[PDB]
Amino acid sequence: NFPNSTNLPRNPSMADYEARIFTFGTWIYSVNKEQLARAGFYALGEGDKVKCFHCGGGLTDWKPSEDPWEQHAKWYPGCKYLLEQKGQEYINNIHLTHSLEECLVR
């Protein structure tokens, strides 16, 4: 299913931070859940799979080193929530970084 790039969220029931934070429960995984919720992610109950309330973007198999906002921007750069909370400059920083990380090896 394609990512949502409209200014309207795909899952408006998860639009409030408090709604999202309730989805995790006891969270054993490597990335802090409050951080995941602030980046707009709620939990699916399927290991450490999160989905963005706005773009619907899904992310799984999180490493301890990884940042929710960075991961959000890498995989779901079209997201209007991300663009609202972080601004296009941040997004360009993140993408230049990830594209330069890729090239410093491949």
Binding mask 68-87 for Zn ion (x = CB under 5 A): --------x--x-x------
Contact 42, 20 (CB under 8 A): yes
> Rounded to an integer, what distance in angstroms lies between the CA atom of residue 62 and that of residue 94?
17
Q: Is 75 in the site for ligand 4XE (CB under 6 A)?
A: yes
Q: Is 60 in the site for ligand 4XE (CB under 6 A)?
A: yes
In the bound state with ligand 4XE, the residue whose beta carbon lies nearer, of 4 and 71, is 71
> Rounded to an integer, what distance in angstroms lies between the CA atom of residue 20 and that of residue 81?
14
Q: Is 29 in the site for ligand 4XE (CB under 6 A)?
A: no
Reported for 20-27, long-range contacts at CB under 8 A and 24+ positions apart, including other chains, are 20/53
Residue 103 annotated as binding site: no
Contact 93, 73 (CB under 8 A): no
The region of 16-24, 36-44, 61-69, 86-94 touching ligand 4XE under the rule CB under 6 A is 61-69
Q: Could you say which residues in the range 12-51 bind Zn ion, by CB under 5 A?
A: none
DSSP string, 70-93: HHHHHH-TT-HHHHHHHHHHHHHH
The nearest distance, CB 68 to ligand 4XE, in angstroms, is 9
Interacting residues with ligand 4XE (CB under 6 A)? 58-63, 66, 71, 75
